[PDB]
Amino acid sequence: RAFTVPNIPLQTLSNSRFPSLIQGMILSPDASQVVQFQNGRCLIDGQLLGTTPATSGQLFRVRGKINQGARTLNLTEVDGKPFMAFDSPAPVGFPDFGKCDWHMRISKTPNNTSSGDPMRSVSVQTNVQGFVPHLGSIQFDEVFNHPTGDYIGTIEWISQPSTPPGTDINLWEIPDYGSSLSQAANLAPPVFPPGFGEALVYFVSAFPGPNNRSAPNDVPCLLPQEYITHFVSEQAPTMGDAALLHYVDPDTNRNLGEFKLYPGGYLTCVPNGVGAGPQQLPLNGVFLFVSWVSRFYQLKPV
Amino acid sequence: TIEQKTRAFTVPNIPLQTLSNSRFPSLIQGMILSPDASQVVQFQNGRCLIDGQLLGTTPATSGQLFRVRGKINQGARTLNLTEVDGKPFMAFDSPAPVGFPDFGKCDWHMRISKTPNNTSSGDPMRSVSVQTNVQGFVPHLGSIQFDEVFNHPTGDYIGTIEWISQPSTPPGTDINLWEIPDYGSSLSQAANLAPPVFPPGFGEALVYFVSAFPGPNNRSAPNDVPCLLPQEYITHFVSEQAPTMGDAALLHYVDPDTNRNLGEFKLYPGGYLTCVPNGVGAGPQQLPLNGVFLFVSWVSRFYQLKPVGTA
Ligand SMILES: CC(=O)N[C@@H]1[C@@H](O[C@@H]2O[C@H](CO)[C@H](O)[C@H](O[C@H]3O[C@H](CO)[C@H](O)[C@H](O)[C@H]3NC(C)=O)[C@H]2O[C@@H]2O[C@@H](C)[C@@H](O)[C@@H](O)[C@@H]2O)[C@H](O)[C@@H](CO)O[C@H]1O
Ligand SMILES: CC(=O)N[C@@H]1[C@@H](O[C@@H]2O[C@H](CO)[C@H](O)[C@H](O[C@H]3O[C@H](CO)[C@H](O)[C@H](O)[C@H]3NC(C)=O)[C@H]2O[C@@H]2O[C@@H](C)[C@@H](O)[C@@H](O)[C@@H]2O)[C@H](O)[C@@H](CO)O[C@H]1O
Ligand code: NA
Ligand code: NA
């Protein structure tokens, strides 16, 4: 099977850390930034990593059982199937937003009622002892004084982490999935700055909530979700050190820049000095696979 | 190019249980037939020709699906709609902004927030309610009306429907997710609505993919939202733009464990699937959800399907 990427403009594609349109393409503000996102991780031959779902349907959802008067949500997969702990860091699609407090909205499922607002607000801190999704559970800030059941929902907005007090949201980081006695199994590995003039490319979307900068909370990810779905469906074997892509303006067929898509499921480019980079490019372009290339291929600067 | 005009038709090679609803972002939880065998549908989302032509308000991807954005003044009840990216909604061109919800015959309970964030603390979320059969529900004309005065700062608000309930009027009537809302007014009909989809007859019945949406109803049952196509199918067709080479695409719903065909379906170019129920009570709801639809061949519209399920 010949390798391809989706023929859809970037601005129409989706973030792979939460369902939303991509709103920007950037380099990390810190050139030394290492990332270890658990969602939006897929080998370009269609092998999912970490907690990454094949599609957006499963992405950024939380499901579990909770008892009336408890603080603990005992996680399942999003479809209600048991979560097999000690295999994965968390259920498939579980949020990977580190260094923030989560303000979630959940409801008891399925509906078995003829009236009533089913929505419940709960808050989750990610650096506390009770945040142990790898062990199958997360702890809410307050006792859950609502009916026992199977609850499903998502993070509605985020805010600064409660501890250490005064620290800001940092969406470049992931939460601590493991416990004091056990580290999380099968975490998607870290992705390091490639060096040799190359820099990692991140796709960003804004997420609701405050921060210390009184600015949008921007969520970086490594791949559009549609790319992941495409790779899972296509299962095209990787035949080079990297896939060479052109970012093409579909209005003119003009090549706006060269990028490498590595087998590990991330993109790089070579910025043409400070001030240059993919953030200078329009967001209506389409990536096009050109050729497999070796490790000795030097990208033309963007 | 030659390659473009000869590009072979394909569908995504992913099990159904992993695919997504095209009326709101959620995994597909089942396949059903409409309870009324004469049910005509006219959903505005999840509408795409199999050569990749989008219809109604259908977005190419899930990123735009089931979102609402607009401007509202403090002390007003009117949300002046824009596209999800903030750009103006060109009214009279479409029934509503791309991705705008098409849930008819229910009250909408929405959650919205002012965008972009310009705060260092505080819960930005606001609850508003929208009735869809009132004179103020005119998305085609560029606006919808909240039930209550909006006593929050004037600005650009984005959000979605969080849960639904029975329509307020006529009092006592139930949610009916088979229906779409009236997008226009009595003096102005909605332009460029995706056309209705009719039962094929002659033994064939339309197939719907369902996902539960939060909220009550008169039956104390899940609010199952039916759609015609998985969203991944729509994205695939938009990307591929494979030419339609026959009246219908014959699909087999194949068990990934045994490679056995569990059911024959026809995917029509208008962007919907049919099957032949194997008697009263039989249908695709009897099939497991881990099957994969595989494209077999182009066939004529007169091609007869092996009946699916058991009576
Ligand atoms: C330190 C403490 O427990 N203070 C209690 C008060 O609770 C705090 O009130 C703040 C406004 O005055 C604010 O709402 C705090 O929460 C927000 O800010 C923090 C930043 O550190 C986090 O970003 C939170 O996620 C965010 N939450 C919301 C909903 O906006 C709030 O502190 C939070 O809640 C308390 C109860 C505790 O769990 C903290 O760990 C948590 O950060 C409270 O208003 C007051 C009256 O009950 O009591 C104070 O002791
Ligand atoms: C008829 C009327 O206006 N009654 C007023 C009270 O409002 C109603 O209260 C009900 C509970 O006793 C219930 O919450 C009604 O709303 C729910 O049910 C209807 C169907 O019957 C719809 O499904 C609504 O969407 C649903 N809403 C919620 C939040 O669950 C409620 O009527 C609704 O709200 C009022 C204000 C009005 O806008 C109605 O059009 C709407 O249906 C109200 O509580 C009371 C003041 O406190 O005044 C009563 O006259
Ligand atoms: Na932990
Ligand atoms: Na109307």
The token pair that represents B246 in the structure block: 């026959």
A57 φψ region: left (φ > 0), alpha (ψ -120 to 50), beta (else): alpha
B279 φψ region: left (φ > 0), alpha (ψ -120 to 50), beta (else): left
Q: What is the number of other CB atoms lying within 10 angstroms of the CB of residue A181?
A: 7
Order of strands across the sheet that contains B223-227: B30-32, B208-213, B223-227
Distance CA B223, CA A116 (A): 14
Residues with CB under 6 A from ligand 1: A 101, 141, 159-160, 162, 165; B 121, 123
- A59 to chain B: closest CA residue: B26
Distance CA B125, CA A103 (A): 10
Amino acid at A224: P
Distance CA A174, CA A35 (A): 8
C-alpha distance from residue A193 to each of A32, A42, A272, B26, B33 (Å): 6, 18, 16, 34, 52
At residue B264, φ and ψ (nearest 5 deg) are -95, 135
A206:B13 CB<8 A: no
User: Could you tell me which of B134, B160, B166 has the C-alpha nearest to residue B147?
Assistant: B134
Peptide bond into A165 cis (omega under 30): no
User: Could you tell me which of A93, A71, A75 has the C-alpha nearest to residue A137?
Assistant: A75
A118:B235 CB<8 A: no
Cβ neighbors of A207 (< 8 A, separation 6 or more) are A18, A20, A97, A157, A158, A171, A216, A217, A218, A219
Amino acid at A126: T
Would the CB of B232 count as within 6 Å of ligand 2?
no
- Helix (H) / strand (E) element for B2: namely helix B2-6
For residues A292 and A267, is the Cβ–Cβ distance under 8 A? no
Distance CA A119, CA A117 (A): 6
C-alpha distance from residue A228 to each of A13, A37, A42, A46, A233 (Å): 11, 14, 6, 7, 9
Question: Could you tell me which CATH number the domain at A59-159 has?
Answer: 2.40.30.120
User: Could you tell me which of A302, A282, A300, A269 has the C-alpha nearest to residue A28?
Assistant: A269
Q: Please, what's the b/e burial string for A237-258 (b: 16 or more CB within 10 A of its CB; e: otherwise)?
A: ebebebbbbbbbeeeeeeebbb
- Helix (H) / strand (E) element for B239: namely helix B231-240
- Which of B103, B107, B148 has the most ligand 2 atoms within 8 A of CB, as the residue to mutate? B107
Distance CA A154, CA A20 (A): 14
Q: Please, what's the b/e burial string for B97-107 (b: 16 or more CB within 10 A of its CB; e: otherwise)?
A: bbbbbbbbbbb
Cβ neighbors of B170 (< 8 A, separation 6 or more) are none
Distance CA A260, CA B145 (A): 48
Q: Which ligand is nearest to the CA of B96?
A: 4
Amino acid at B123: D
For residues B227 and B46, is the Cβ–Cβ distance under 8 A? yes
* Residue B277 three-state SS: strand
Experimental technique behind these coordinates: X-ray
Cβ neighbors of B258 (< 8 A, separation 6 or more) are none
Order of strands across the sheet that contains B205-206: B205-206, B272-275, B261-268, B248-254, B292-299
Cβ neighbors of B87 (< 8 A, separation 6 or more) are none
* B77, β-bridge pairs: none
The topology (CATH level 3) of A1-58+160-302 is Nucleoplasmin-like/VP (viral coat and capsid proteins) (2.40.510)
When scoring B1, B18, B54, B114 by the number of chain A Cβ atoms within 10 A, the one with the most, hence best to mutate, is: B18
Would the CB of B164 count as within 6 Å of ligand 2?
no
Distance CA B49, CA B52 (A): 5
Amino acid at B43: F
* Residue B81 three-state SS: strand
C-alpha distance from residue A27 to each of A24, A110, A205, A238, A268 (Å): 10, 43, 14, 25, 9
Amino acid at B170: P
C-alpha distance from residue A293 to each of A125, A224, A232, A245, A289 (Å): 44, 22, 22, 10, 11
User: Could you tell me which of B39, B32, B232, B194 has the C-alpha nearest to residue A233?
Assistant: B232
Distance CA A61, CA A198 (A): 34
Distance CA B54, CA B178 (A): 20
The token pair that represents B91 in the structure block: 């009214």
DSSP letter at B22? S
Place of tokens 């990208």: A299
Nearest CA to ligand 2 atom 26: B165
Q: Which ligand is nearest to the CA of B172?
A: 2
For residue B95, the number of C-alpha atoms closer than 13 Å in the C-beta half-sphere is: 23
> Angle formed by the axes of helices A225-234 and B231-240, to 10°?
80
Listed resolution, Å: 1.6
Distance CA B27, CA B48 (A): 19
For residues A207 and A103, is the Cβ–Cβ distance under 8 A? no
C-alpha distance from residue A139 to each of A119, A120, A163, B175 (Å): 18, 15, 15, 35
B239 interaction partners in chain A (CB closer than 8 Å):
6-8, 226, 230
C-alpha distance from residue A82 to each of A75, A76, A77, B2, B95 (Å): 8, 5, 6, 49, 42
For residues B16 and B28, is the Cβ–Cβ distance under 8 A? yes
* A35, β-bridge pairs: A191
B163:A11 CB<8 A: no
The topology (CATH level 3) of B1-64+166-311 is Nucleoplasmin-like/VP (viral coat and capsid proteins) (2.40.510)
Question: Could you tell me which CATH number the domain at B65-165 has?
Answer: 2.40.30.120
For residues A121 and A104, is the Cβ–Cβ distance under 8 A? yes
Q: Which ligand is nearest to the CA of A71?
A: 1
At residue B261, φ and ψ (nearest 5 deg) are -75, 120
Q: What is the 3-state secondary structure (H, E, C) of chain A?
A: CCCCCCCCCHHHCECCCCCCECCEEECCCCCCCCECCCCCCEECCCEECCCCCCCHHHCCCEEEEECCCEEEEEEECCCCCECCECCECCCCCCCCCCCCEEEEEEEECCCCCCCCCCCEEEEEECCCCCCEHHHCEEEEEEEECCCCEEEEEEEEEEECCCCCCCCCCCCCCCCCCCCCCCCCCCCCCCECCCECCEEECEEEEEECCCCCCCCCEEEEECCCHHHHHHHHHHCCCCCCCEEEEEEEECCCCEEEEEEEEECCCEEEECCCCCCCCHHHCCCCCEEEEEEEECCCCCCCCC
Place of tokens 């050729």: A291
Distance CA A286, CA B267 (A): 29
Q: What is the number of other CB atoms lying within 10 angstroms of the CB of residue A45?
A: 17
The token pair that represents B87 in the structure block: 């750009």
Nearest CA to ligand 2 atom 32: B168
For residues B285 and B32, is the Cβ–Cβ distance under 8 A? yes
At residue A176, φ and ψ (nearest 5 deg) are -85, 105
End-to-end CA distance of chain A: 30
Q: What is the number of other CB atoms lying within 10 angstroms of the CB of residue A182?
A: 13
Strand residue runs (E) in chain B: 30-32, 68-72, 76-82, 107-114, 126-131, 143-150, 155-165, 205-206, 208-213, 223-227, 248-254, 261-268, 272-275, 292-299
For residues B70 and B59, is the Cβ–Cβ distance under 8 A? no
Ligand 1 atom showing the smallest separation from residue A100 Cα: 23
Domain extents in chain A: 1-58+160-302, 59-159
User: Could you tell me which of A23, A7, A19 has the C-alpha nearest to residue A283?
Assistant: A23
